Design a protein around this motif. Structure first.
Motif, mmCIF file in Angstrom:
data_model
loop_
_atom_site.group_PDB
_atom_site.id
_atom_site.type_symbol
_atom_site.label_atom_id
_atom_site.label_comp_id
_atom_site.label_asym_id
_atom_site.label_seq_id
_atom_site.Cartn_x
_atom_site.Cartn_y
_atom_site.Cartn_z
ATOM 1 N N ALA A 159 1.107 -1.156 -0.183
ATOM 2 C CA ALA A 159 0.256 -0.138 -0.032
ATOM 3 C C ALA A 159 0.643 1.230 0.462
ATOM 4 O O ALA A 159 0.155 2.333 -0.881
ATOM 5 N N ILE A 160 2.157 1.359 0.424
ATOM 6 C CA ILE A 160 2.720 2.464 1.034
ATOM 7 C C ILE A 160 3.030 2.397 -0.305
ATOM 8 O O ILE A 160 3.377 4.135 -1.079
ATOM 9 N N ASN A 161 4.142 1.460 -0.876
ATOM 10 C CA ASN A 161 4.877 2.305 -2.253
ATOM 11 C C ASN A 161 3.789 1.909 -3.611
ATOM 12 O O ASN A 161 4.156 3.542 -3.916
ATOM 13 N N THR A 162 3.044 1.851 -3.671
ATOM 14 C CA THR A 162 1.516 2.159 -4.639
ATOM 15 C C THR A 162 1.035 3.710 -4.777
ATOM 16 O O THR A 162 0.777 4.305 -5.891
ATOM 17 N N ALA A 163 1.181 4.081 -3.264
ATOM 18 C CA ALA A 163 0.289 5.131 -3.169
ATOM 19 C C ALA A 163 1.735 6.324 -3.048
ATOM 20 O O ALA A 163 1.284 7.317 -3.671
ATOM 21 N N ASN A 170 1.635 12.154 -10.139
ATOM 22 C CA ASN A 170 1.420 12.745 -10.056
ATOM 23 C C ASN A 170 0.675 13.648 -8.741
ATOM 24 O O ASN A 170 -0.193 13.202 -7.621
ATOM 25 N N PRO A 171 1.737 14.977 -8.007
ATOM 26 C CA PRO A 171 1.060 15.595 -7.383
ATOM 27 C C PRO A 171 -0.191 16.290 -7.304
ATOM 28 O O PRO A 171 -0.637 16.369 -5.928
ATOM 29 N N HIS A 172 -1.399 15.933 -9.014
ATOM 30 C CA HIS A 172 -2.058 15.608 -7.888
ATOM 31 C C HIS A 172 -3.626 14.986 -7.896
ATOM 32 O O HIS A 172 -4.363 14.875 -8.226
ATOM 33 N N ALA A 173 -2.795 13.803 -7.199
ATOM 34 C CA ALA A 173 -3.852 12.780 -6.996
ATOM 35 C C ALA A 173 -4.433 12.517 -5.645
ATOM 36 O O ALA A 173 -3.746 13.309 -4.680
ATOM 37 N N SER A 228 -5.823 17.790 4.141
ATOM 38 C CA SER A 228 -4.904 16.562 3.792
ATOM 39 C C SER A 228 -5.386 16.054 1.832
ATOM 40 O O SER A 228 -6.207 16.352 1.849
ATOM 41 N N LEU A 229 -4.322 15.366 2.075
ATOM 42 C CA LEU A 229 -4.226 14.381 1.003
ATOM 43 C C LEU A 229 -4.528 12.897 1.022
ATOM 44 O O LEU A 229 -4.507 11.923 0.006
ATOM 45 N N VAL A 230 -4.996 12.467 2.266
ATOM 46 C CA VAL A 230 -6.102 10.966 2.130
ATOM 47 C C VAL A 230 -6.965 11.019 3.024
ATOM 48 O O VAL A 230 -6.923 11.437 4.269
ATOM 49 N N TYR A 254 -7.929 18.295 -7.087
ATOM 50 C CA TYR A 254 -7.123 16.920 -7.485
ATOM 51 C C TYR A 254 -7.868 16.566 -8.946
ATOM 52 O O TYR A 254 -9.012 16.807 -8.752
ATOM 53 N N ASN A 255 -7.187 15.470 -9.595
ATOM 54 C CA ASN A 255 -7.892 15.298 -10.536
ATOM 55 C C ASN A 255 -7.667 13.621 -11.248
ATOM 56 O O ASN A 255 -8.247 13.167 -12.392
ATOM 57 N N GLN A 256 -7.022 12.947 -9.951
ATOM 58 C CA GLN A 256 -7.690 11.512 -10.176
ATOM 59 C C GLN A 256 -7.635 11.246 -8.383
ATOM 60 O O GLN A 256 -6.936 11.612 -7.392
ATOM 61 N N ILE A 257 -8.352 9.845 -8.810
ATOM 62 C CA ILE A 257 -7.868 9.071 -7.011
ATOM 63 C C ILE A 257 -7.858 7.777 -7.773
ATOM 64 O O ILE A 257 -7.896 6.873 -8.480
ATOM 65 N N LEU A 258 -6.912 7.681 -6.119
ATOM 66 C CA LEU A 258 -6.368 5.751 -5.689
ATOM 67 C C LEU A 258 -7.563 5.792 -4.387
ATOM 68 O O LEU A 258 -6.850 6.678 -3.148
#
Ligand code: NI
Length: 341
Positions: A159-163, A170-173, A228-230, A254-258
């Motif tokens: 999870a940490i490596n993926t995020a 993309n700093p805007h995710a 926050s970005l989480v 933001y322009n993307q969600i994971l």
């Protein structure tokens, strides 16, 4: 009416038995952990003694408004006398505040009730090392060999490596994590820590986390969603519709969600290693289902029980069908023949 596997013989005690009204002959009610299938029934109107951990007691007082005079928190790893009977609370390696309960009956019988647990070799060096256990009331949630899943540490590494990779590309995710109960806090906490953010959430979820004795929580969590970005959302919103709708609310930041959905076991565990897990994706939204379990795998369960060597096992999960009960009993006898007890 209260089922037999919630009653401790030779005592006035029940375990996780609050949904059956006043139980005939019960003088003290134990609660192993703050999950709704176990606390169901408790409120400000409850007027019998409840015995539990310190963390569970903070949750009872603040979330369910149970009155302080009826809450009896016990320290862990410490012999305590309740209504004339010696008991010990042990860490269950489940959610925050979750315990197993050791009862030393007046006649010499020793009973372990696991509550919900994720068995671990570290338990082999607790106060369990020091005496025989006659009866084991066992969390059999995943009692079949098909139930395999990775260690919590490998799932968190993924999870940490993926995020960290997604947000660095993309700093805007925005990262989103689903929840519906206490437990699995490492998922959203470890991602926020790698990204240098706090975790943003509803006031009701923040209040729940502040009950948990997690050191430096003022440091990792917030109600200020803009800072926050989480973000933490109810589990029911972790789908393409709910996530699209959330992204609108964020006002073009933001322009993307994971997103992450911690589940327990799913059948894609039978075919795929954690390394090789991929998301479901629609447009600028990707959703990862990650097998973060707070219950024993089959192998972890079997190791614990073969070490403990109990004389009798009482399952507390999967007890409702003849095929489930028969399958579990067949595994308990294999384990006993293999290990020689
Ligand atoms: Ni539970």
């Amino acid at each position: 009416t209260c089922p037999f596997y919630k009653k401790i013989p030779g005592t006035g005690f029940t375990v996780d038995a609050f949904q059956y009204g006043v139980v005939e002959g019960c003088t003290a009610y134990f609660l192993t952990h703050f999950h709704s299938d176990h606390y169901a029934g408790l409120s400000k109107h409850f007027t019998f003694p409840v015995y539990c951990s310190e963390i569970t007691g903070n949750l009872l007082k603040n979330k369910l408004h149970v009155q302080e005079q009826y809450i009896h928190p016990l320290p862990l790893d410490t012999e305590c006398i309740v209504n004339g009977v010696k008991v010990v609370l042990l860490d269950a390696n489940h959610c925050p505040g979750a315990v197993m309960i050791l009862f030393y009956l007046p006649n010499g019988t020793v009973i372990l009730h696991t509550g919900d647990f994720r068995a671990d070799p570290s338990m082999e060096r607790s106060l369990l090392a020091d005496q025989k256990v006659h009866m084991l009331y066992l969390d059999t949630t995943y009692c079949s060999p098909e139930y395999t899943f990775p260690s919590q540490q490998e799932v968190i590494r993924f999870a940490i490596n993926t995020a960290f990779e997604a947000v660095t590309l993309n700093p805007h995710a925005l990262v989103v994590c689903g929840t519906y109960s206490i437990g699995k806090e490492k998922v959203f906490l470890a991602i926020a820590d790698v990204l240098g953010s706090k975790v943003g959430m509803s006031q009701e979820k923040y209040k729940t986390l502040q009950c948990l004795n997690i050191p430096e929580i003022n440091s990792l969590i917030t109600t200020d969603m803009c800072s926050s970005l989480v973000h933490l959302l109810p589990m029911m919103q972790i789908n393409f519709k709910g996530l699209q709708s959330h992204l609108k609310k964020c006002g073009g930041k933001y322009n993307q969600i994971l997103a992450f959905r911690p589940t327990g076991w799913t059948h894609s565990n039978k075919f795929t290693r954690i390394a090789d897990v991929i998301p479901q994706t629609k447009g600028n939204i990707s959703i990862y289902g990650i097998p973060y379990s707070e219950h024993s795998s089959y192998l972890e369960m079997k190791r614990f029980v073969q070490w403990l060597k109990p004389q009798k096992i009482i399952p507390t999960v999967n007890v409702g069908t003849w095929k489930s009960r028969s399958t579990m009993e067949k595994y308990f006898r294999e384990w006993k023949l293999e290990a020689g007890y």
